[PDB]
Design a protein around this nucleic acid. Structure first.
Length: 408
RNA sequence: CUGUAUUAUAU
C-alpha cells in the first residue's frame, strides 16, 4: 500500500478566459451563454466547478439565478460541498460576492442551507469587515440573514464585532439601521449591551434619534428592553440608562420631525415605560402645552399625552390650558381661544374632549365631576365662537363631539 | 380646514 500525494493542477489562466463575455454589462462566461444572456441548457454545476467560474456566474443576474436554483440543499451532497469550498476558499472573493448586487443572493441561499460547520467559516469571513459590510446595500442583506439563521454564539461574535465602532454613522445609514434593528430585535440583550452603553451618551442619542433612520433604531431598542417575567433588574438597568438620556433631552426630541414618534411610543406604551411617561409630561410638556400644540410635530405628542396620561397629570395639563397663561395684551385671547382656531391645535382640543368624555365613565365620582367641568369650559368657549367654527371642518367635528351630552 | 417619519437590494 504505497502512498500517493496528489497535488492539484495549476490552472493559472482560467479567470482570464472566463472574462470573455458577449455583453459588456453582463459577466456570464460566453461558454455558458445561449447568445441571449441566458444559461445554455447543456451547462451543469459540474461545468461551473470544472471551469472555476463560480464568481462569473454569481456576478451575473441569470447565472446567479441558475446557482440559486440548482444548489443542492443537503449538506452531505458533494456538489454542495465543492461549491461551498469555491465560495469560502478565498476571503476577498467571498466578501466581494457579498457586496455584489447579484452575488449576495447566492450567499443568502448558502446561509439558508448551512449547518453549524459551514456557519463557522462564514462567520469568520464576515467578522473581518462586518462594519463596512453593514454599510453596503447588498451585504447588509447578508448580515441580516446571518443574524437570523446563525447559531446564537456565532451571531453574538459577529454582533460584538461592532463594539467600539462609529455607531452614529452606522445607526443613521439607510442600510445599516436595519442591521442594528435586526440585532436588537433578534439576539439576546447580552450580545448588544454595548449599543445601550453607546446611546447612554446624550450627544450620540440626540444625533441618532433626530434622524429618519436612527429614530427607528432607538425605538426598536426601547421596545425590546421594555417588553418583559424577570426577578432581577438587568434589562431594567439597561432601559433606565437609555431612558435617562431621552428624559434629559425630551423637550428637544418632542418637537423634532423624527424623534416625536419615539416620544409618543414612550407615552402610549404604559407598563414598563409608564414612569418615564410621567417624567416627560412633568419636565417637558408642562409649561409648554400652548407652544407645542401649535407645532406640526409636537402637537401629536400633546395629543397622545392627553390620551394616555394618568388623571393626576391630565389635571395639571387641563389646568395649564384653562388657567396657565397670561391673555394676549392686544386680543385678550387665552390658550383655548388660540387652539380652537389653530390648524394644529384644533386636534389637541378634540383629544381633550375625547379624554373628558371617556373619563366621565371613571369610577371615582370626583374625577367624573372634574372631567365634566372641563367639558363645560370647552362647551362654553365653543358656543361663544360657534358662528365661525361651524364654517371649518375642525369646528364641525368639535361641535359634533360635544352633542347630546349629560356632563353630570 | 383640516395636520408629521422610516418600513431599504435582481444590471
Amino acid at each position: 500500500a504505497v502512498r500517493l500525494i496528489d497535488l492539484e493542477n495549476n490552472a493559472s489562466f482560467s479567470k482570464s478566459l472566463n472574462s470573455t463575455t458577449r455583453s459588456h454589462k453582463c459577466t456570464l462566461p460566453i461558454w455558458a451563454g445561449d447568445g441571449e444572456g441566458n444559461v445554455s441548457d447543456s451547462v451543469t454545476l459540474q461545468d461551473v466547478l470544472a471551469n472555476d467560474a463560480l464568481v462569473e456566474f454569481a456576478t451575473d443576474k441569470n447565472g446567479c439565478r441558475f446557482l440559486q436554483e440548482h444548489y443542492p440543499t443537503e449538506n452531505d451532497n458533494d456538489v454542495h460541498q465543492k461549491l461551498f469550498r469555491k465560495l469560502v476558499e478565498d476571503r476577498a472573493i467571498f466578501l466581494s460576492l457579498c457586496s455584489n448586487m447579484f452575488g449576495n443572493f447566492f450567499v443568502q441561499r448558502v446561509l439558508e442551507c448551512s449547518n453549524t460547520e459551514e456557519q463557522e467559516i462564514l462567520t469568520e469571513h464576515l467578522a473581518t469587515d462586518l462594519y463596512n459590510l453593514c454599510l453596503d446595500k447588498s451585504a447588509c442583506r447578508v448580515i441580516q440573514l446571518a443574524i437570523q439563521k446563525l447559531d446564537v454564539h456565532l451571531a453574538t461574535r459577529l454582533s460584538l464585532e461592532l463594539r467600539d465602532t462609529h455607531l452614529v454613522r452606522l445607526s443613521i445609514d439607510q442600510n445599516g439601521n436595519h442591521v442594528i434593528q435586526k440585532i436588537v430585535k433578534t439576539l439576546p440583550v447580552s450580545s448588544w449591551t454595548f449599543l445601550v452603553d453607546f446611546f447612554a451618551d446624550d450627544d450620540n442619542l440626540i444625533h441618532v434619534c433626530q434622524d429618519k433612520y436612527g429614530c427607528r433604531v432607538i425605538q426598536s431598542t426601547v421596545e425590546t428592553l421594555s417588553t418583559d417575567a424577570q426577578c432581577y433588574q438587568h434589562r431594567v438597568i439597561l432601559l433606565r440608562s437609555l431612558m435617562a438620556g431621552v428624559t434629559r433631552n425630551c423637550t428637544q426630541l418632542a418637537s423634532n420631525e423624527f424623534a416625536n414618534y419615539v416620544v409618543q411610543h414612550v407615552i402610549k406604551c404604559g407598563d414598563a415605560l409608564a414612569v418615564y411617561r410621567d417624567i416627560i409630561i412633568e419636565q417637558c410638556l408642562l409649561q409648554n402645552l400652548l407652544s407645542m400644540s401649535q407645532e406640526k410635530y409636537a402637537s401629536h405628542v400633546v395629543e397622545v399625552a392627553f390620551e394616555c396620561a394618568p388623571y393626576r397629570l391630565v389635571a395639571e395639563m387641563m389646568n395649564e390650558i384653562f388657567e396657565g397663561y397670561i391673555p394676549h395684551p392686544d386680543t385678550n385671547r387665552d390658550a383655548l381661544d388660540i387652539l380652537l382656531f389653530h390648524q394644529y391645535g384644533n386636534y389637541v382640543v378634540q383629544q381633550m374632549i375625547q379624554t373628558c368624555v371617556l373619563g366621565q365613565n371613571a369610577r371615582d365620582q370626583k374625577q367624573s365631576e372634574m372631567y365634566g367641568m372641563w367639558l363645560e369650559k370647552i362647551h362654553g368657549r365653543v358656543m361663544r365662537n360657534a358662528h365661525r367654527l361651524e364654517r371649518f371642518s375642525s369646528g364641525k367635528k368639535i361641535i359634533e363631539a360635544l352633542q347630546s351630552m349629560s356632563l353630570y
